[PDB]
Design a protein around this nucleic acid. Structure first.
Ligand SMILES: O=C(O)CCC(=O)C(=O)O
Ligand SMILES: [Mn+2]
Length: 204
DNA sequence: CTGTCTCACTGTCG
DNA sequence: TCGACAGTGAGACA
């Protein structure tokens, strides 16, 4: 397996196709069968005083005994299922990084998306990386420097763009999530679903 | 109280 | 139709 080292000012990420086509195909099928996504309040978000559905399905899974913050609430992730443990194990076996939690985001097509954000690190093990594993449709992913955002950016730091392919792993290492925002922009020409798993190491 | 940060839509311009 | 870009606030903090 070949790794791409993604580097810029305050950006340190690595990218590889971690699962080959056949394995990634099987995993995608099993995720589509088995993952249980949020419904009701957890699938709603208020933005600028207006309520909308979250523009992607979400779920969490993790180790027994864990809790996390999401919406309004302190919540417990669902118990691991084997397909998720298969993925986690291969990530940990290759990288030596260990994870106790995963956020799953399912993008039905190019109209599902996630706006520019930094992962909330408050309840994460200090300095821990986040492993982003993708199955299904390739989707464009964008890194934008925190001081290069908006109408009149303080700095004109180059955006870093890359497609996240079927079976790929993007490792995002400290201090990427301090200095850079990332997003999965709307791509209306993408008609097929994508399931993304972001593994994290949360505080007990 | 006191700031700062966040989430995603809709409308306009091309 | 697509998309780039700007503009929109209430809630959770430190
Ligand atoms: O779907 C992706 O690849 C990004 C998801 C993400 O950044 C997140 O949920 O924090
Ligand atoms: Mn993220």
């Amino acid at each position: 397996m070949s790794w791409r080292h993604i580097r810029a000012e305050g950006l340190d990420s690595s990218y590889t196709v971690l699962f080959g086509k056949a394995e990634a195909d099987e995993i995608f099928q099993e995720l589509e069968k088995e993952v249980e996504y949020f419904t009701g309040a957890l699938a709603r978000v208020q933005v600028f005083g207006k309520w909308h559905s979250v523009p992607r399905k979400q779920a969490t899974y993790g180790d027994a005994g864990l809790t996390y913050t999401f919406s309004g609430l302190t919540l417990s992730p669902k118990p691991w299922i084997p397909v998720l443990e298969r993925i986690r194990d291969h990530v940990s076996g290759v990288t030596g990084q260990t994870f106790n939690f995963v956020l799953i985001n399912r993008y039905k097509d190019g109209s599902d998306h996630i706006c520019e954000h930094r992962d909330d690190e408050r309840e994460l093990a200090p300095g821990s990386p986040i492993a982003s594993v993708s199955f299904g449709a390739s989707r464009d992913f964008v890194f934008r420097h925190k001081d290069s955002r908006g109408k009149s950016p303080s700095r004109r730091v180059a955006v870093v763009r890359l497609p996240l392919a079927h079976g790929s792993l993007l490792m995002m290492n400290h201090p990427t999530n301090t200095h850079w925002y990332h997003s999965l922009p709307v791509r209306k020409k993408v008609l097929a679903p994508r399931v993304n798993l972001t593994f994290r190491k949360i505080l007990l």
